[PDB]
Amino acid sequence: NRWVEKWLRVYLKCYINLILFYRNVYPPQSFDYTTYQSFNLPQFVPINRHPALIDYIEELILDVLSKLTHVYRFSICIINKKNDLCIEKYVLDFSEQIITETEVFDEFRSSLNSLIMHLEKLPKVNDDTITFEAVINPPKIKLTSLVGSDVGPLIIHQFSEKL
């Protein structure tokens, strides 16, 4: 907690929405990438417009940040067939009196810009035949890390092991 909760919860909800669009768990043109901005960013922010599913992920990120205080290594795996290894492990490592609101709000841009740098630079294996599943701990896997959160109090290692 301690005032990083609001921007962390919107950061994970927008991170889930961007994963849902750019790795097409749902149909890609089943979104609205037009009228929503997450932070002060140029790029499209494609949230599913489904009210029951935005409430579903609303409760998902709200309950994982409810259990934030003793949360373990966070990840999201996209599964349709046997892979059995984590795809996108945005590891929420709990730190701890630093007053960082503006700087962390800027920091979630670069986390999400590392996300889109992983997203638009990403190949295409199969259309719509996949389903995500949030999980806390495709012939061959590949390792890729993204930016950290050193300006933020909590550090996020933001690993994304694709396939």
């Binding site: 309950d63 994982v64 259990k67 373990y72 599943e133 949030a134 999980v135 806390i136 701990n137």
Partner: peptide, 8 residues
């Protein structure tokens, strides 16, 4: 034990 199951 089981994890990410109640958070399934």
């Amino acid at each position: 034990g089981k994890r990410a199951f109640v958070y399934g």
